[PDB]
Amino acid sequence: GHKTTRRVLKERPSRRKGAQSKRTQFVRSLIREVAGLAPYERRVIELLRNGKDKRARKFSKKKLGTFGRAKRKCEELQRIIAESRRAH
Amino acid sequence: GALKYLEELSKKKQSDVVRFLLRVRCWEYRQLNVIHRASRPSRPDKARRLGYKAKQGYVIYRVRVRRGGRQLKYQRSLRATAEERVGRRCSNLRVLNSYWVNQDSTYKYYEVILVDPNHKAIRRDPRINWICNPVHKHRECRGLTSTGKKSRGLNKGHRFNKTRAGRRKTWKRHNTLSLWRYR
Amino acid sequence: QEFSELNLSEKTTKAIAEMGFTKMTEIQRRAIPPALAGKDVLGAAKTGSGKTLAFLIPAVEMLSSLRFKPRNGTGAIVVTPTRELALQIFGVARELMKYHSQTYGVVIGGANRRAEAEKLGKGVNLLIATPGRLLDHLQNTPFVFKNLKSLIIDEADRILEIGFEDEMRQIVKILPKEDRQTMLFSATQTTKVEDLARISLRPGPLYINVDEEKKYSTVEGLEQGYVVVEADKRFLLLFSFLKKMAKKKIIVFFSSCNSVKYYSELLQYIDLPVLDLHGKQKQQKRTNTFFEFCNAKSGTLICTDVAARGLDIPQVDWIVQFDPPDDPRDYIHRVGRTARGNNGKGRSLLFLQPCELGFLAHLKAAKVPVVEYDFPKNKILNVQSQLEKLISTNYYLNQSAKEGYRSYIHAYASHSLRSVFDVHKLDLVKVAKSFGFSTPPRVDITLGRRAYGSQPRQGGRYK
RNA sequence: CUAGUAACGGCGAGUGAAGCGGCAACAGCUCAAAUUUGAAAGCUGGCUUCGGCCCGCGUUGUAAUUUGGAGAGGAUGCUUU
RNA sequence: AAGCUCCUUCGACGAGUCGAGUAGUUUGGGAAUGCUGCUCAAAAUGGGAGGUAAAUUUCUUCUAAAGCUAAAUACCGGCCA
């Protein structure tokens, strides 16, 4: 509508209120190994180690409630499988 | 330091370590009294982020609450029932906050951080002595804790139109016929 | 022609007078008057002629004449290949704007991204940048670059050699073009340099040639000595060398200015007298120090290899390359020729770790005779415990050690010969022990299938 | 004032807001997630000749610093009690 | 002790909580309007809520699950006038 000269704004410190911090990633990874897995996470990991990815995604979706949360959990457990094989 | 790790651990409550520890504690709490004094918080990260300080005048009290419906559902939260029962046992203390610590098949266990308003260590501290004022007498009975703030719908937005300033005050404001002098 | 002849501002004349420069080279005298007239400049000068002032005088004059303020963002952008060249140009620009209210700043790959983002958001009038980080800040950070009037591209042959071709293509595409004066410099003239001059500069350039035609890059009359030393003992060996080759002339080359400053303070405390040439001092101090070293019977001068690239190297007994060379071809040929000398032959020693030995294979391919220098283990003066106590107790030396360690790691990471010099093969604990640390300080070494049913995007706006 | 509007309803009885706009009044802050680590620097009590002495709480964290349209650390030079 | 400036250094933000399914209750309000009980149970360039047929969810705007705070407002009661 009306013409005004747009400004470039100062970078918001509230932007990315999640974590790009390496220390929180370190703490999250260490706790995962120390604590272990949930029973449903162990079932998903035993399906993923057998190559049954479709069943794993359906089980995760059923027990989490969203396809995005299921995808994120399946990627996390696949990453855990990858580092476990690398350590093996 | 360690509280960051404990926060991340508390975020995995079905993992082996946390599940094992929750079951052993639930067994012990089940065989204790319904409302019993806890020497220290079982979840120090959670108590610390809710305002608990290792200072004379701060008290933890664990309480078990029978879970389930009252098909009439109790519009009161189980966490609110816990704070009210503890607030009557410790009628000389002010309920600061409370948090979930455990759950069983028939009970849900909560820990309530209380504050003594007559201790000199609390009355001299400008960060907590607001609770020494008599307007904070029995905050759990008037919906003034965290559960009370959630159950009364005290949030900003179009979704909370009828409850953000009090439901009954809003209803009285909308049902009042205003007649001015010059009509 | 002298610097007082042109009608510069009185602030710029005073700053050049403090530097001590009263006479120009050919490239300054032939580039500054046309560039002050607003004409784009194509150059053929090499490193060390004095091209830095040749592109910094018109930028400073433009920034002062248009009365730029920190709320106006970038007015002039100087793109450099490496971070140490950018820091040298930043030191020169800091000396040039001593009386100018305009701001100046450096943006280099390997530094804090968030601190650089805040620096760019507050407003940097003259921006000396590295292409990858400049493109990253131009694309993902909010800062004002709409008032750009000068784009200087410096040493374009090296930037096209490293592989920043597509980065500069996107940089020229992003940057505003209307009323922008472009000045591009390169010591050679390739097809990629011609392509860059075609996309960047306007249809009418001005082509200026200041270059020696008698380059003596013969591959037979040379002899390069090397010493194989592990990382954690490297400095110790140098210290022993610099205490055993006393009463002699030694030039030592380091990769960064920060490590030169750290080792200068370190050798001041560890009672070994040296002379320092780093880009954090006054130009007058540096010229007087180099003049004093050039007219001395003995002594050792420590400096950066890129800082002494444009320096008349005198007759010295030893030329030591302590850090990896930035330009290995230039190092071998030209620095070996200046090490051999006009009279009785000096020697050019190179410090090699036992993970960069493939350089020797390169010396096998270029047919350059090599000489291996070994050292006894018992003749190394062990001052490691004193060094660690000094680093642990002195806060200024701890800061300097951390800065030198970070600068060494980042300069090693941004290396042209990544096969010979790879940061991933470096043991950080040992090199930090060489810098004087019990534990290595934290640094960033780095700094399938397509989707099912996904067809390429054909519309929409993404910011 | 919006406005008996939107919305919902044996779409009947009816029920029934909110943003903007004008005004009254206006005021902003405290923590948790940091190692004081070259020094628990913090606090409740008791004894007092009232000036400073003891026991205890507390390191599973009491002071200071910081609270994300922020902040810290160094450097820097002015300005404040 | 404090404010500001600068930057080749850093920048931790609340979980049986969001959310999914389901039963009540409530609202003008099935993006369930909000709340509660049961079952399952998250994330980290994350999360929430909106805008948009516009070519793919482009864009916009805020940070929940910790806390304090006067004034304008109400008033069949209290001390009076």
Automatic annotation (TrEMBL), chain A:
Any one Gene Ontology molecular-function term assigned to this protein's record: structural constituent of ribosome
Compositionally skewed regions (Basic residues) per UniProt: 1-20
A GO cellular component entry from the record: ribosome
Record-level GO BP terms: translation
Protein family: Belongs to the eukaryotic ribosomal protein eL36 family.
Shown residues within the full chain: 23 to 110 of 110
Keyword annotations from UniProtKB, A to Z: Ribonucleoprotein, Ribosomal protein
Name the UniProt record assigns to this protein: 60S ribosomal protein L36
Top-level taxon of origin: Eukaryota
Keyword Transmembrane helix attributed: no
From TrEMBL, chain B:
Entry annotated with the keyword Metal-binding: yes
Biological processes annotated in GO: cytoplasmic translation
Gene3D superfamilies assigned to the protein according to its UniProt record, in alphabetical order: Ribosomal protein l15e
GO molecular function, one term: structural constituent of ribosome
Biased composition (Basic residues): 149-166
Positions of region (Disordered): 145-166
Keyword Phosphoprotein in annotation: no
GO cellular component labels: cytosolic large ribosomal subunit
Domain of life: Eukaryota
Keywords: Metal-binding, Ribonucleoprotein, Ribosomal protein
Family listed: Belongs to the eukaryotic ribosomal protein eL15 family.
Protein name in the entry: Ribosomal protein L15
Provenance organism: Chaetomium thermophilum (strain DSM 1495 / CBS 144.50 / IMI 039719)
Automatic annotation (TrEMBL), chain C:
Keyword Ligase part of the UniProt annotation: no
Domain Helicase ATP-binding intervals: 32-207
Top-level division of the source organism's lineage: Eukaryota
Domain DEAD-box RNA helicase Q as annotated: residue spans: 1-29
Keywords on record: ATP-binding, Helicase, Hydrolase, Nucleotide-binding, Nucleus, Ribosome biogenesis, RNA-binding, rRNA processing
Annotated ranges, domain Helicase C-terminal: 221-391
Membrane spanning residue stretches: none
Localization per record: Nucleus, Nucleolus
Gene Ontology molecular functions: ATP binding; ATP hydrolysis activity; RNA binding; RNA helicase activity
Record's function text: ATP-dependent RNA helicase involved in 40S ribosomal subunit biogenesis. Required for the processing and cleavage of 35S pre-rRNA at sites A0, A1, and A2, leading to mature 18S rRNA. RNA helicase.
The record's note on its domains: The Q motif is unique to and characteristic of the DEAD box family of RNA helicases and controls ATP binding and hydrolysis.
Quaternary context: Associates in the nucleolus with the 60S and pre-60S ribosomal subunits.
The family this protein is said to belong to: Belongs to the DEAD box helicase family. DDX18/HAS1 subfamily.
Entry protein name: ATP-dependent RNA helicase
